[PDB]
Amino acid sequence: YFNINYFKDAASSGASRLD
Amino acid sequence: NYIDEVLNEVLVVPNIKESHHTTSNSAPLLDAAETGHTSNVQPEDAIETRYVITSQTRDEMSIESFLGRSGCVHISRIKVDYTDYNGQDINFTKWKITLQEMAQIRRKFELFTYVRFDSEITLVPCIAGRGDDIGHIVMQYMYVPPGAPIPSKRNDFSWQSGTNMSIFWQHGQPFPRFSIPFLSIASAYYMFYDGYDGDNTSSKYGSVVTNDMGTICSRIVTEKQKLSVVITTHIYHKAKHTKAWCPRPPRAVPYTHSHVTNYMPETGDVTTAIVRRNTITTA
């Protein structure tokens, strides 16, 4: 389960990723 | 990605190869640190190493797991009054946003010159019953961006939030939480600054000249109650999607005041964490 930005804005999202 | 990300094996450290002896000219152990650079010497260089396949990730050593953790940055308090409700400057709080009203966390950033990130604010209101029954105490947390009518007192006209943000929490329903975009006119949040307001030999100089992000005003909507209370709404903050530029030496002197570096304690000699030894000879 993931990438389901339930919210529109980007500022709202999980902790970013890593690379 | 998954596995690597679920297993948390994204940033892995190299292994320690095997070595043999060296009765040779080039001496890697010798460099001149005056170049300001950093040595590059390793185990394998200095000793007769073996062979260890590593398996330690530098995942948790990322500006996001170093920074991305919620921290008390403010504790809004309201010792209600029922005697005079409304009145000027009462029963409603107003705080000017900042990460340095609380060491801990202030500390942590300050490790870098510039920073940037989207912030997630979590509100933990705690209702202390000073009465024989607290009723239903609703709450309004309004965010007032710079240059805006800040409530003079409890019911202004500004609590209509016709175009502002006000989050509402009623006893029972869980902790309010909301995210906010990076708010700065600048490409990054100035963790520090070596600027002033102006040439006025009375101008301001610091991390303030620059970051004035508005305020957060708390209200307890419910009206007059019978049995008193005191509300303590804790403000936690987390940094999600963070970047950092030009690291700095950590802080070792307990600060005082914010938006300033000033250490000079009230009388007490400036104290630091360093411990004293009798002799260098024995540790």
């Binding site: - | 007032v144 961006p145 710079p146 240059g147 805006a148 009518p149 006209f157 500004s158 209509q160 939030s161 016709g162 175009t163 502002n164 708010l183 006119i185 600048a186 490409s187 307001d197 102006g198 101008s203 301001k204 000249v209 620059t210 004035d212 508005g214």
Partner: protein, 178 residues
């Protein structure tokens, strides 16, 4: 003047002296006289502003009348100029009053921070704009010797705002009845 209409006109006068100054206002678009303006009134609904801006002036003078004003934009950095030379040194536009009638002065965007705050802030100080006589106001016989100029401000395609917030320019120290 203020509670009336005049509060809108700027009469270009005599001027015994020469190279004298007309008026000045500061650019910080949320600052009376600016503020109240369709723009200002607005901007005061957002926390941050940006881009260029346009000031336009019109001669409600006469036909046979003539003049030449010098308008200038003094970027943020120093004090609103006391003298013309000092102000002419920066951004400006000489305006030749003639068959046309409207000169439009642009206010480039000069700033450190891609963005400026709409709220009064020493930092985000946009600067000043001022107007002075280049020549005079010459009028042939039996024409009035004072006349007015109207001034306006519209945006530039540069322009843009953000971070909505509740306004400044309106306190409802009411309520409102029935």
């Amino acid at each position: 003047n203020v509670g009336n209409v005049s509060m809108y006109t700027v009469q270009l006068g005599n001027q015994t002296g020469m190279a004298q100054k007309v008026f000045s206002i500061k650019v910080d678009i949320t600052s009376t006289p600016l503020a109240t303006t369709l723009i200002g009134e607005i901007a005061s609904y957002y926390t941050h502003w940006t881009g260029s801006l346009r000031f336009s002036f019109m001669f409600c003078g006469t036909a046979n009348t003539t003049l030449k004003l010098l308008l200038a934009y003094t970027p943020p950095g120093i004090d609103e100029p006391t003298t013309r030379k000092d102000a002419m040194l920066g951004t400006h536009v000489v305006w030749d009053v003639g068959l046309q009638s409207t000169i439009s002065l642009v206010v480039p965007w000069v700033s450190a921070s891609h963005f400026r705050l709409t709220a009064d802030n020493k930092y985000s100080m946009a600067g000043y704009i001022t107007c002075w006589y280049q020549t005079n106001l010459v009028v042939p016989p039996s024409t009035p010797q004072t006349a007015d100029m109207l001034c306006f401000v519209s945006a530039c395609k540069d322009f843009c705002l953000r971070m909505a917030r509740d306004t400044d320019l309106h306190i409802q120290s009411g309520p409102i009845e029935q």
